[PDB]
């Protein structure tokens with residue numbers, strides 16, 4: 001297996017996760033790629049609620065966890081049982097960084113919810129795509145995506161603290177060009193996977 | 195003043211909550227009536243998912259709590275700030291009885307989620323409509339609703355244990371006629387509210 005991509009909006013997660021998916025398929029792995037929230041029919045409904053409705057921060061946390069629970073039970077656990085490489089575009093560190101460090105919700109509580117939703121399933125490696133917020137925001141602005149700079153500075157700092165506190169997290173310099181970032185990822189992956 | 199109706203499917207909650215809503219409105223209270231899950235636009239979408247999609251028991255728990263959180267923040271807390279009497283058709287005991295006693299999820303974990311979703315808001319009184327499962331099932335059969343006898347027997351017993359452990363839960367014998375059950379509810383309510 002399980003490879004998680006983490007990092008702020010605009011760090012290149014969706015781009016890199018797709019590159020890694022295609023690369024590992026070509027190398028002969030059986031691989032799955034899922035996004036969080038989403039990745040199942042029910043999860044995609046919850047994703048649309050999360051991205052379109054005005055929600056309070058507590059309802060948001062519970063819906064992220066509900067989407068994760070469905071994806072874990074429906075797809076990830078069955079995939080891992082069949083020795084598929086599962087790549088996730090976001091996972092439990094995003095919930096801690098955004099809902100905990102960003103929104104101020106209790107992190108011990110978030111971690112208990114994460115454990116409940118995941119049944120204790122943990123990544124073999126987490127690739128934290130680290131990038132200065134101003135650089136990320138300029139990438140996003142090009143595609144008419146806007147995120148709050150004050151909020152994301154807290155989240156960025158939170159991810160970096162988590163890379164020291166949580167297990168199996170490798171910090172990737174995501175400021176570089178696409179192929180350069182991918183090479184860094186492949187170097188990090190050689191720590192857990194042929 | 196927060197008044198919660200609890201009990202198994204077919205115990206008369208929706209019937210009696212509406213009766214109470216009308217009665218208190220006539221007596222000059224400003225009253226709200228909400229159902230769980232549901233009661234908000236988002237909560238109603240979540241209710242539809244809960245009632246129509248195949249879900250694992252953990253995802254179910256989290257959606258029940260998400261609906262509760264939305265209702266608490268959007269409607270319940272603002273209503274209580276305005277001195278409205280808020281009547282709930284189900285609340286936190288339903289989660290402990292169904293997801294805990296029924297499905298076997300950890301009760302302390304469920305209580306922590308309850309506290310999170312509610313911001314610690316507790317009812318002034320909870321009316322547990324207790325009824326034998328057989329009676330409930332026969333009332334539901336008349337309306338083409340079917341529920342699982344084995345499951346509901348565990349849930350009934352769970353509610354009854356909760357009525358002993360949790361604060362301000364009154365057990366109502368709800369197997370009698372509708373008008374008699376309502377009279378018992380009013381007698382119970384007189385302990386906390388001028389009715």
Ligand SMILES: Nc1ncnc2c1ncn2[C@@H]1O[C@H](COP(=O)(O)OP(=O)(O)O)[C@@H](O)[C@H]1O
Pocket residue numbers: 007008009010011012013014015016139140142143174175176177178181
């Ligand atoms: N290494 C890179 N350098 C510059 N732009 C990039 C790079 N990687 C991705 N992008 C572009 O930046 C934006 C954000 O990338 P995306 O993969 O959507 O990030 P995330 O999923 O982390 O928000 C997209 O427009 C994408 O094409």
Ligand SMILES: Nc1ncnc2c1ncn2[C@@H]1O[C@H](COP(=O)(O)OP(=O)(O)O)[C@@H](O)[C@H]1O
Pocket residue numbers: 201202203204205206207208209210333334336337368369370371372373375
């Ligand atoms: N006291 C009662 N005796 C007989 N039937 C009842 C009584 N109260 C309600 N009913 C009927 O039983 C069914 C279940 O009532 P309802 O209020 O929907 O229960 P709940 O909301 O607890 O499932 C409905 O068809 C309703 O009209």
Ligand SMILES: Cc1cn([C@H]2C[C@H](O)[C@@H](COP(=O)(O)OP(=O)(O)O)O2)c(=O)[nH]c1=O
Pocket residue numbers: 008009010013014036037064089090091094095096098099
């Ligand atoms: C998985 C997850 C995402 N999110 C947020 C991050 C994003 O702003 C939003 C949607 O996710 P996503 O589409 O991955 O954002 P992006 O491509 O911009 O990185 O959901 C949380 O707040 N908590 C979570 O647990």
Ligand SMILES: Cc1cn([C@H]2C[C@H](O)[C@@H](COP(=O)(O)OP(=O)(O)O)O2)c(=O)[nH]c1=O
Pocket residue numbers: 202203204207208230231258283284285288289290292293
């Ligand atoms: C509020 C709540 C309801 N439920 C279940 C009980 C019901 O079978 C279902 C829908 O609620 P509802 O329509 O109140 O059922 P009924 O009128 O038959 O009592 O949701 C839970 O499992 N957990 C919860 O926390």
Ligand SMILES: [Ca+2]
Pocket residue numbers: 138139142
């Ligand atoms: Ca650019």
Ligand SMILES: [Ca+2]
Pocket residue numbers: 175176177180
């Ligand atoms: Ca460089």
Ligand SMILES: [Mg+2]
Pocket residue numbers: 013014015
């Ligand atoms: Mg993305």
Ligand SMILES: [Mg+2]
Pocket residue numbers: 057103104105
């Ligand atoms: Mg906050």
Ligand SMILES: [Mg+2]
Pocket residue numbers: 092093110111114115
């Ligand atoms: Mg965790």
Ligand SMILES: [Mg+2]
Pocket residue numbers: 207208209
């Ligand atoms: Mg009902």
Ligand SMILES: [Mg+2]
Pocket residue numbers: 251297298299
């Ligand atoms: Mg179970």
Ligand SMILES: [Mg+2]
Pocket residue numbers: 286287304305308309
């Ligand atoms: Mg509770």
